[PDB]
Amino acid sequence: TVESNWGGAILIGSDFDTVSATANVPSASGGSSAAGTAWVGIDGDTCQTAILQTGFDWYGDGTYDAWYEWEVSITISEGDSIQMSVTATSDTSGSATLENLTTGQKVSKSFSNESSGSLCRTNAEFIIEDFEECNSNGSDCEFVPFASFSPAVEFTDCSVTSDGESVSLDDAQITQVIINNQDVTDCSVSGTTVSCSYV
Ligand SMILES: N[C@@H](Cc1ccc(O)cc1)C(=O)O
């Protein structure tokens, strides 16, 4: 039973502009079906109408993948350093960028006139998640088995902007992934770093 599927730091506020950080790609285990994801994003917490996010997933069979969302895809390998960023120019327009830094590859997507859902620009976050896999229309969504990973996934040089001004993580709320009533992550903040160890 997955009781909490998000681990990491969440800032609450208004007019959030850009959210970005660099994260290392960990080694993962637990089987081909086990997985995990690290991403940066805007909204999705108190603002449940939309979510602008981008990041990458790791699977227990040693494979990886990158994605953005308001579509998958860059080649990702254990140890790579990935710079992730999202920008909300408005409640209905923005962009998502993912750059491997280690391989020199970079991908980006611009969004506009999004009708699927609008942003409030009130939540900024750096998250490690036990994501869901859905199918059969949408009548069946299940959390993927949570993969073990190492070393710790660290979001470094975290940056959050509001109305053009910087916002420290000083007052960010902290959450942990919790499965079968046990913390499976130990995410903590310090300076401009959000560090999440697997437990
Ligand atoms: N994962 C939840 C959404 C969620 C949003 C924010 C959280 O802090 C935790 C969970 C769902 O599938 O509906």
From Swiss-Prot:
GO-annotated molecular function: aspartic-type endopeptidase activity; glutamic-type endopeptidase activity
Catalysed transformations (reactions): Hydrolysis of proteins with broad specificity, cleaving 24-Phe-|-Phe-25, but not 15-Leu-|-Tyr-16 and 25-Phe-|-Tyr-26 in the B chain of insulin
Keywords assigned: Aspartyl protease, Disulfide bond, Hydrolase, Protease, Signal, Zymogen
Keyword Protease set for record: yes
EC number(s) given by UniProt: 3.4.23.32
Site (described: Transition state stabilizer): Q53
Subunit (UniProt): Monomer.
Protein name: Scytalidopepsin B
